[PDB]
Design a binder for this molecule. Structure first.
Ligand SMILES: COCCCN1Cc2cccc(C(N)=O)c2C1=O
Ligand SMILES: COCCCN1Cc2cccc(C(N)=O)c2C1=O
Lengths: 350, 342
């Protein structure tokens, strides 16, 4: 029997849950008869991203309808969908491809989690699966100052437009991924280090913990992402928490706090599909209409914690309601905490 | 008393009827908004609504908020569809079609305002505040200018052949002096800019300008700058000529590119990061760097289309953008002929 703290055990059961992986694929309308979890592969996912990249090129550089249509057929042949009686969406515009890009990002992480789950020994399974994460996980005391500051960050940065649910913090975990300390070392030195959120489906955490946050593969279309292929973070808990993709049918999710070394920010208000930064720049800040009150900002260890409540920023001519922060090198991030959140979905409008 | 090929130019760009036709082809309702009533401020408000729509879409505003803005657009700019439904402005594509139209209307209003304000041909010349001279068909200037035309016609723009007709040397009053500080910058290059004829009176009295503050930065692939090509045909596509109307105008401009920000895909910016003075959108095809010429610090990239080793890009051919009007110095205005197969 495992000697791991009970919250840690429960975390392990959540992450390594085949049924949630299946639910995830069904949400993307993948036909599980034609493509079962066990038959997902990296190569298939790589080729699918290749097809989206070709699709976007064929659209940018004005290919013919026939070619666009062929590329769509190829995508849906490789990734089988069940659309019911709904018209299968042609991949002939930025919106349609961005949606498929997000599905593939999640497919990639599900493949990693299912791989990790199916690998190793068949001791307590909980301990066998814990070791697969290659991460030291400690439970933060509910009454710590550490816990209070974090509950305050959650409370204060919930955006007013994310009004469908309230968040309640169930468990807080201190995490240290094997070898990430050393990896982050050089950036430890950089100015403008910030403690920011990253939200993800619950089973994506097998890959996130074992491999860390990653940039999309070279096959993935740079145009698939608002600010290109980097690692995305929010300073508003609810903007990240939406990426948990929880529902009243499955209302517990997980979210990371990570220290990110931003340095000099390239400040942008609209899409910029970049893969590299111009010289002088270490990150992108996408500027939101709403920004945490910088009066309320705290800092420890030279890291800023933007836990002020949201106030109007200077900015009105923007594509974003809230800020977002992108780095283009995986070493720029050091994961600090992992929070287990219950999403309490609202029944009243008042 | 002005030369002939010049006199033709003045008539062609101050043509009230071409302006009327551009309007009809956009399905503008000329009874409610006749040419005479076009307002710069009205166009700016229309642009502003397009900005709101695009921001509403990106920010995830309600369908009813977006529907309202789309109706507001058509309140402002009277269209006549006149049995069909005005297109819904709720996506970047529909919005994009209206951005391009407003870009044209803004220029048409400039032209018409000139013509109304204050031999009419030479009253009109006066107002352009631009010195124009003809270039000799035989002179060396014309031979280099014709070679640039011929070498840089892209192969995917095969629907037509091009042939030069007149070459005009232009000097906008005040533009040398405006450009002075920028002449010091490196990577100065002689590039093309195509526009429709209804646009050229505005361009000559005012120079190449950036879309107004009200215009959406997301309406343009690299945001609000001035766009140039090194392929004559990429630029000439923007003349919007046809079998039925085969004569277009094109600019050759000296552009101070400086330290280029080199990009492969859309970036909707209104300013450059520190240290960058222009954007180069990278094409799959680029003129041969071997055939390049330098003339008193200005490069003329008249090499023939060769492959750049850059294949993961949104662009068949290069594009150059500057974000300060003062980085451009207009050198030549060409009058060309399109020979369509068909
Ligand atoms: C992971 O794919 C990136 C593209 C989609 N985005 C954008 C974004 C902005 C801010 C925060 C997050 C986040 N996950 O917490 C994300 C996010 O996933
Ligand atoms: C004024 O509209 C800006 C966006 C449309 N673009 C892009 C572009 C690229 C290269 C050359 C030109 C040109 N006019 O020759 C243009 C052009 O008009």
């Amino acid at each position: 029997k495992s000697k791991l703290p009970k919250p840690v055990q429960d975390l392990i059961k959540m992450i390594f849950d085949v049924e949630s992986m299946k639910k995830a694929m069904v949400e993307y309308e993948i036909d599980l008869q034609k493509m079962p979890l066990g038959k997902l592969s990296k190569r298939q996912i790589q080729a699918a991203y290749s097809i989206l990249s070709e699709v976007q090129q064929a659209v940018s550089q004005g290919s013919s309808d026939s070619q666009i249509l062929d590329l769509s057929n190829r995508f849906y042949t490789l990734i089988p969908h069940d659309f019911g009686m709904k018209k299968p969406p042609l991949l002939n515009n930025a919106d349609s491809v961005q949606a498929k890009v997000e599905m593939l990002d999640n497919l990639l992480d599900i493949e990693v989690a299912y791989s990790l789950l199916r690998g190793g020994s068949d001791k307590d399974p909980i301990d066998v699966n814990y070791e697969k994460l290659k991460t030291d996980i400690k439970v933060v005391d509910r009454d710590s100052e550490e816990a209070e500051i974090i509950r305050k960050y959650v409370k204060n940065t919930h955006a007013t437009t994310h009004n469908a649910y309230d968040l309640e913090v169930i468990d807080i975990f201190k995490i240290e991924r094997e070898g990430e300390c050393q990896r982050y070392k050089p950036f430890k030195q950089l100015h403008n280090r910030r403690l920011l959120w990253h939200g993800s489906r619950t089973t994506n955490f097998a890959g996130i913990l074992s491999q860390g946050l990653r940039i999309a593969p070279p096959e993935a279309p740079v145009t698939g992402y608002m600010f290109g292929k980097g690692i995305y973070f929010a300073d508003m808990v609810s903007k990240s928490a939406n990426y948990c993709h929880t529902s009243q049918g499955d209302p517990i999710g997980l979210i990371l706090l990570g220290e990110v070394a931003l340095g000099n920010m390239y400040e942008l208000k609209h899409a910029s599909h970049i893969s590299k930064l111009p010289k002088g720049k270490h990150s992108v800040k996408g500027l939101g209409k709403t920004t945490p009150d910088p009066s309320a900002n705290i800092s420890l260890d030279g890291v800023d914690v933007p836990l002020g409540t949201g106030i109007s920023s200077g900015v009105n001519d923007t594509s974003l309601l809230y800020n977002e922060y992108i780095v283009y090198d995986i070493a720029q991030v050091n994961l600090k905490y992992l929070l287990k959140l219950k999403f309490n979905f609202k029944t009243s409008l008042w």
